[PDB]
Amino acid sequence: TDRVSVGNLRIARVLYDFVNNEALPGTDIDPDSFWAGVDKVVADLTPQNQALLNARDELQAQIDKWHRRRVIEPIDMDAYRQFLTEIGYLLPEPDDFTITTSGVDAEITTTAGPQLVVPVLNARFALNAANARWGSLYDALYGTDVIPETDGAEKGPTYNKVRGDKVIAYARKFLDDSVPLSSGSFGDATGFTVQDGQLVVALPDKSTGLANPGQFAGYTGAAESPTSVLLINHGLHIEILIDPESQVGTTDRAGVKDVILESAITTIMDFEDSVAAVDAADKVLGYRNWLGLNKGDLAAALRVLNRDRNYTAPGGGQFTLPGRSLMFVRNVGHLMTNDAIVDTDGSEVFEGIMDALFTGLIAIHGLKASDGPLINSRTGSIYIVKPKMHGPAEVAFTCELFSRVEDVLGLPQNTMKIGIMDEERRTTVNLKACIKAAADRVVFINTGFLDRTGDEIHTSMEAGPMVRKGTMKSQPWILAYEDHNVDAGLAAGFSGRAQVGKGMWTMTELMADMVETKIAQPRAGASTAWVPSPTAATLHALHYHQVDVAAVQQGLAGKRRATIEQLLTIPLAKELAWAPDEIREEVDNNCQSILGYVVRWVDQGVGASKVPDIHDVALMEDRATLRISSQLLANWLRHGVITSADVRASLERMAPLVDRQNADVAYRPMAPNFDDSIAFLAAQELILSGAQQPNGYTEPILHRRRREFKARAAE
């Protein structure tokens, strides 16, 4: 074949060469020692990895049966809880404790702000994301619907001054609200100066300073007429760019050209739900981008990584600020294998194990000088998001894997830190124990509410028909889950030490709506939450200026706002809940979103796509949102809400509509020859086989179908 033999492993040549030629050089790790380490870790840890996956299946089978043997209508919560406890699903809560994780950067322990997630296989997106630490407020406002396109203020081929003025006014109000003047408004400012190290703002009638002179962080240019003024509020920087010569500045009362916000404080470079990588070739593409990010030389077309930013302190001396988003990497979880490496028997190696080895290896570069200062962690940490874990034993396993990898890489123990996704029910209900299992590695917890919703549906699949997808966000279980997560983090001493994060805004074009509603997340004490783009990061930063998360967290301390009973409230629908038109809409909406996402996954290897839903709302789709849709339809089919003819008819009805939306270029229509389309059959399979997928996961089918598509293409 095209494999390299090391011990009991047979490594795809493309991966072997990448590691030897590109990843290892510069780390001072001996190539032969590295590969011996891979062999040993894989051999040592594979058995427990398999045992954990088996335990999931066993627990689900018992719960399935428990529901089928229920006669009593209103589910008996006391009995249900006792059953979960008996089978080892619900474990004892440990005594209070405080996490001890150290060597963590300020962006994580202390700074509250947006966290951006981006597919690592897309180099351009990854570059923009790394560079999203700073972003233009004017661009974000002008370019989105945050400023309405009412009569007069519509966007067009050229600059609209009426809209420009609304942008200016919006930002002036932001400044008044965030960094207030002693008296007067920024709206009436005519200039800025620095005298005796103090910010002085010219008003038409008098001059004034900040209500809080401490918010003045520095400036650029001459003190007598700065080219910019740097402010700080709630730990985040705001920069007013002063330039009367510019188009916008010419029209401005104080010659202001733009207001720049510190935006995406940290970014997660994703190997998991937002990318499609099903073999060694795909994995290498991803690994190479992560390498380029950490070595600091990733470049497109040239677009490159930003350097740090230089400022003068109020007093006159010099300082710098980070120009890049501090990077995490999201590895895949414990489920999947990948044929990038197979053993002598031809068995595929667990992908999570490989990701820890290879992403960890590559991250070493980000800890050292780049052709420039080192790119990433100045405190010496590697930041890894670990998704889709179920319960404390699975967290303990991730910790043991990272420990073994550190030994192979010659890194200090606990270098590799863990961002824990709380996105599976068996983690939610055992959250305190999960944090404790990683007490010296954890750098965040985050409510991955989309995956968590998929797991909610699958876990209780046999219980009955679930409510419509759009109803889930307001169900008792999810509201308890969100508060429970914050409570556990604060109780474990996260304030000042680790992020308490919440989930993704998927409506990429609904920025007015995002600005209105996502403020709920920091108001709930989350020190970070997920955004889908650098523009959304800049707009979400507004919320952290309005809400003092540090104060909110202090206020929430010691509260227990969710009960186990509330967490365990299954979102069953009521009898006769739906008219036919409602059922039809749910079916068509789900099939449309499934087909829209899956067609690009299977035929083009794209793991995240904007897919208009049935209401024509552009939604960023990833595997988690697919997990929900496929599981919901699987559940409705299982309980007789819909028939197999209903499903097939809906798929065939929506497919041509998806074809139309993709009609460009490497796209192959699904209709009318449905049985000839691997993409269509994948979509169908996710629904018709959904109840039989482990925990409702979409990867086994997606990976199989993508590999099938590639094989046909090659023949």
Ligand X SMILES: O=C(O)C(=O)CC(=O)c1ccccc1Br
Reading phi first (left if > 0) and then psi (alpha if -120 to 50, else beta), residue 152 is in left
Name the catalytic one among 330, 425, 623, 705.
330
Structure tokens at 33: 């020692």
Answer yes or no whether residue 117 interacts with ligand X by CB under 6 A. Answer: yes
Tell me which DSSP letter residue 264 carries.
-
Hey, what amino acid is at 32?
A: D
Answer yes or no whether residue 273 interacts with ligand X by CB under 6 A. Answer: yes
Answer yes or no whether residue 274 interacts with ligand X by CB under 6 A. Answer: yes
Size of the site for Mg ion (CB under 5 A): 5
Chain mean position to CA 557: 26
Of the candidates 341, 624, 637, 641, which one interacts with ligand X according to CB under 6 A?
624
Answer yes or no whether residue 176 interacts with Mg ion by CB under 5 A. Answer: no
Name the catalytic one among 252, 622, 646, 659.
622
CB 202 within 8 A of CB 192: yes
Stretch that binds Mg ion, among 214-222, 445-453, 558-566, 670-678 (CB under 5 A): 445-453
DSSP assignment of 645-667: HHHHHHHHHHHHHHHHHT---S-
The values of phi and psi at residue 24, to 5°, are -75, -40
Of the candidates 258, 394, 451, 613, which one interacts with Mg ion according to CB under 5 A?
451
Least separation in angstroms between residue 451's CB and Mg ion is: 3
Q: How many other C-beta atoms can be found within 10 angstroms of the C-beta atom of residue 242?
A: 23
The pairing of beta strand 416-422 with beta strand 382-386:
parallel
Instruction: Give the integer Cα–Cα distance in Å for 317 and 339.
Output: 56
HEC secondary structure over 528-594: EEEECCHHHHHHHHHHHHHCCHHHHHHHHCCCCCCCHHHHCCCCECCCCCCCHHHHHHHHHHHHHHH
Stretch that binds ligand X, among 500-508, 638-646, 662-670, 692-700 (CB under 6 A): 500-508
Instruction: Give the integer Cα–Cα distance in Å for 89 and 391.
Output: 8
- Is 330 a residue of the active site? yes
Q: What character string, x for contact with ligand X (CB under 6 A) and - otherwise, covers 73-112?
A: ----------------------------------------
Stretch that binds Mg ion, among 155-163, 423-431, 527-535, 645-653 (CB under 5 A): 423-431
Q: Which of residues 409-438 bind ligand X (CB under 6 A)?
A: 423
Cα-trace Rg, the chain = 26
Which residue, 105 or 451, is less far from Mg ion as judged by CB? 451
Stretch that binds Mg ion, among 208-216, 287-295, 308-316, 448-456 (CB under 5 A): 448-456
Q: Which of residues 174-233 bind ligand X (CB under 6 A)?
A: none
Least separation in angstroms between residue 275's CB and ligand X is: 10
Answer yes or no whether residue 424 interacts with Mg ion by CB under 5 A. Answer: no
CB 465 within 8 A of CB 631: no
Instruction: Give the integer Cα–Cα distance in Å for 570 and 472.
Output: 11
Which residue, 504 or 688, is less far from ligand X as judged by CB? 504
Q: How many degrees, rounded to 5, is the angle at CA 696 between CA 385 and CA 676?
A: 110
- Is 622 a residue of the active site? yes
Answer yes or no whether residue 455 interacts with ligand X by CB under 6 A. Answer: no
Which residue, 450 or 510, is less far from Mg ion as judged by CB? 450
Burial grade of 245 (CB within 10 A; 0-12, 13-18, 19 or more): exposed
Q: Which of residues 598-617 bind ligand X (CB under 6 A)?
A: 608
Size of the site for ligand X (CB under 6 A): 18
Which residue, 23 or 63, is less far from Mg ion as judged by CB? 63
Block residue for tokens 């994780």: 101
Tell me which DSSP letter residue 305 carries.
P
- Which one of Mg ion, ligand X, none interacts with residue 548, CB within 5 to 8 A by kind? Mg ion
CB 528 within 8 A of CB 112: yes
Answer yes or no whether residue 624 interacts with Mg ion by CB under 5 A. Answer: yes
Of the candidates 218, 448, 607, 690, which one interacts with ligand X according to CB under 6 A?
448
Answer yes or no whether residue 504 interacts with ligand X by CB under 6 A. Answer: yes
Stretch that binds ligand X, among 425-433, 501-509, 635-643, 668-676 (CB under 6 A): 501-509
Of the candidates 622, 659, 685, 699, which one interacts with ligand X according to CB under 6 A?
622
CB 343 within 8 A of CB 349: yes
Reading phi first (left if > 0) and then psi (alpha if -120 to 50, else beta), residue 346 is in left
Stretch that binds Mg ion, among 258-266, 323-331, 417-425, 662-670 (CB under 5 A): 417-425
Which residue, 208 or 398, is less far from ligand X as judged by CB? 398
Answer yes or no whether residue 448 interacts with Mg ion by CB under 5 A. Answer: yes
Q: Which of 355, 353, 352, 438 is nearest to 392 (CA)?
A: 438
Least separation in angstroms between residue 85's CB and ligand X is: 26
Q: How many degrees, rounded to 5, is the angle at CA 193 between CA 192 and CA 196?
A: 150
Answer yes or no whether residue 607 interacts with Mg ion by CB under 5 A. Answer: no
Stretch that binds ligand X, among 361-369, 484-492, 618-626, 658-666 (CB under 6 A): 618-626
Least separation in angstroms between residue 308's CB and Mg ion is: 27
Q: Which residues of this protein are in contact with ligand X, per CB under 6 A?
A: 117, 270, 273-274, 423, 448-451, 503-504, 506, 532, 608, 620, 622, 624-625
Positions marked catalytic: 330, 622
Q: Which residues of this protein are in contact with Mg ion, per CB under 5 A?
A: 423, 448, 451, 548, 624
